[PDB]
Enzyme design. Structure first.
Site, PDB file in Angstrom:
ATOM      1  N   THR A  45       0.819  -1.200   0.000  1.00 36.94           N
ATOM      2  CA  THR A  45       0.000   0.000   0.000  1.00 36.94           C
ATOM      3  C   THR A  45       0.866   1.269   0.000  1.00 36.94           C
ATOM      4  OG1 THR A  45      -1.457  -1.292   1.487  1.00 36.94           O
ATOM      5  CG2 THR A  45      -2.005   1.030   1.107  1.00 36.94           C
ATOM      6  N   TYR A 108     -13.274  -3.445  -2.950  1.00 31.12           N
ATOM      7  CA  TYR A 108     -14.172  -2.957  -3.985  1.00 31.12           C
ATOM      8  C   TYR A 108     -15.197  -4.035  -4.322  1.00 31.12           C
ATOM      9  CZ  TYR A 108     -16.131  -1.220  -8.384  1.00 31.12           C
ATOM     10  OH  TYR A 108     -16.997  -0.847  -9.391  1.00 31.12           O
ATOM     11  N   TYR A 134      -3.213 -10.188   4.735  1.00 32.15           N
ATOM     12  CA  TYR A 134      -3.246  -8.774   5.089  1.00 32.15           C
ATOM     13  C   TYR A 134      -4.689  -8.318   5.196  1.00 32.15           C
ATOM     14  CZ  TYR A 134      -2.219  -3.710   4.058  1.00 32.15           C
ATOM     15  OH  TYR A 134      -2.116  -2.333   4.008  1.00 32.15           O
ATOM     16  N   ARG A 139      -9.448   0.080   4.556  1.00 36.89           N
ATOM     17  CA  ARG A 139      -9.280   0.231   3.113  1.00 36.89           C
ATOM     18  C   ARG A 139     -10.128  -0.723   2.283  1.00 36.89           C
ATOM     19  NH1 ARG A 139      -4.684   3.328   1.659  1.00 36.89           N
ATOM     20  NH2 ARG A 139      -3.406   3.851   3.460  1.00 36.89           N
ATOM     21  N   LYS A 162      -0.773  -9.839   8.627  1.00 35.62           N
ATOM     22  CA  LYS A 162      -0.617  -8.421   8.871  1.00 35.62           C
ATOM     23  C   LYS A 162      -2.001  -7.918   9.258  1.00 35.62           C
ATOM     24  CE  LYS A 162       0.544  -3.896   6.967  1.00 35.62           C
ATOM     25  NZ  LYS A 162       0.744  -3.072   5.729  1.00 35.62           N
ATOM     26  N   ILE A 205       4.431  -4.289  10.502  1.00 32.00           N
ATOM     27  CA  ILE A 205       4.810  -3.932   9.146  1.00 32.00           C
ATOM     28  C   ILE A 205       4.462  -2.458   9.066  1.00 32.00           C
ATOM     29  CG2 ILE A 205       4.281  -4.240   6.689  1.00 32.00           C
ATOM     30  CD1 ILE A 205       3.939  -7.274   7.408  1.00 32.00           C
TER      31      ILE A 205
END
Ligand SMILES: [Cl-]
Ligand SMILES: [Cl-]
Lengths: 292, 292
Positions: A45, A108, A134, A139, A162, A205
């Site tokens: 990202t 999305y 992750y 997001r 993560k 991270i």
């Protein structure tokens, strides 16, 4: 054996005139290695992966792999919201010499928990390389439910998460379902590391480790050695507060550029901070460094 | 002066053995045209655009454009979270004969409001074709603020907003800042159309219209004529509640396949409903059709 413990860096992409600057990339990676980064997460990202071309991603990844040459794990962000394309990218990252791949949940489109299992297992099956899941609901607007993390942790190549939920109930629910010896939990939120480490996480991270790798890793090592790190975190917390001025990596690139790694340039749709905010953020970095 | 008013269809992609079934696509489009669809939105969320190849998207779009041949506007979903790639896709959609393009806000990376302006204006500038903005915070975790909609509405090619906020205070703030004669507001949530039409919206870009286009358009026309449509909506509301069993387009494809367009197949990371849920949703559709 865990891929790493402590501070992995969510590596930025240095641009000069909207072109990846390999010289700056190498200099940045060298700076991270010199200052005790424990892993380099490439094309994630913070690297602006959504706006990089495939050729850029592959060039960056090969450049980092070759420079690091086994000093720390190089973990390639390859996962997207398209399973087939994620497979292709993951196989290519392995071929280039990545030590692991990182796979975000879909976004999305999203999917349900059954779809997550199919998605992550398909990519893990194809790549036959350690996989870091992750989860970043801020997001993606979806999550990897604790029961789903449990299922996935049983896959031979799925070895870590993560965890950017910033939800400590979630952390406890995951912990009770997985084996920390074989499945690592890395924070994906720089803000929460003191508690994340106290509660048995394996590391982080990190965005801010792009510019203060030594100090951020020192936090992990300090608590590992049995220090209280609440006071040590405080000035880092102040810098993180300043970093919150906009959506990552808009702010962090104000600082990487300040350290001489590329220009202060974001690729659309991201944009740089305006000058006043850039100055304030750089002053916050300077204040942090001065205070040491 | 609007591309359309009333019901635009967020067109599904029919798959047979994981291949786009052009025969089913044409049959579905013919069904929509026969049943009073006012526009066809191609390669959007409901089309599974994130998992389609570029060749597939272009093939689907050309097929729909050629079949429709000016009977209704064909609006190409071309926007992604990468501005440069969105420009390329938009220019190609224009070359294929699209009447307009639709551009979602960024997602995963997101951006700030200044970035939205740069992103949307850059694509609009390049394509020089009517642009429908698309705001769906439940999938992007960002929004197009009313003041930003105002700014964007002033661009000669930015002519409408697909508004999936389901926030009627937001709608009122947008309405105060835009000119309804030149900037259309389309609902992006089938469930809210009664209130959306009565708060002065121009129509809807609809998932359920993939299978009940005639009935859904009849709501718009009914309220256009001055009838109150609350009671008329009730049975459609019941079907929409059944459709909420999973993330779109997982449920709607249970119904398009049921009507003979393509098999009940989703592309990973999406997955089909399990059989029990598939049966219940198909029964809800049959109940709705019975009940007319
Ligand atoms: Cl950089
Ligand atoms: Cl279909």
């Amino acid at each position: 054996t865990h891929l790493f413990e402590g501070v992995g860096v969510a590596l930025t992409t240095p641009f000069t005139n909207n072109k990846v600057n390999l010289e700056a990339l190498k200099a940045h990676v060298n700076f991270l290695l010199e200052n005790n980064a424990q892993a380099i997460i490439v094309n994630g990202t913070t690297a602006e992966s959504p706006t990089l071309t495939t050729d850029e991603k592959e060039l960056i990844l090969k450049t980092v792999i070759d420079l690091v040459d086994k000093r720390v794990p190089v973990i390639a962000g390859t996962g997207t919201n398209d399973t087939e394309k994620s497979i292709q990218a993951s196989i290519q990252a392995k071929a280039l010499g990545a030590d692991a791949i990182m796979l975000i949940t879909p976004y999305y489109n999203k999917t349900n928990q059954r779809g997550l299992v199919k998605h992550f297992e398909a990519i893990a099956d194809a790549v036959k390389l350690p996989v870091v899941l992750y989860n970043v609901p801020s997001r993606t607007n979806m999550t990897i439910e604790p029961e789903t993390v449990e299922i996935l942790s049983q896959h031979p190549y799925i070895v870590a998460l993560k965890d950017a939920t910033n939800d400590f109930e979630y952390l406890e629910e995951v912990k009770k379902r997985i084996d920390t010896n074989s499945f690592a939990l890395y924070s994906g939120n720089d803000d929460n590391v003191v508690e994340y480490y106290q509660r048995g996480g394996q590391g982080v991270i990190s965005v801010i480790a792009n510019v203060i790798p030594k100090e951020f890793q020192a936090l992990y090592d300090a608590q590992q050695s049995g220090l209280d790190i609440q006071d040590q975190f405080k000035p880092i917390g102040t810098l993180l507060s300043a970093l919150s001025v906009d959506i990552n990596p808009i702010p962090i690139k104000a600082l990487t550029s300040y350290l001489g790694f590329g220009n202060y340039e974001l690729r659309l749709p991201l944009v740089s901070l305006e000058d006043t905010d850039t100055k304030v953020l750089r002053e916050a970095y300077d204040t942090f460094k001065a205070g040491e």
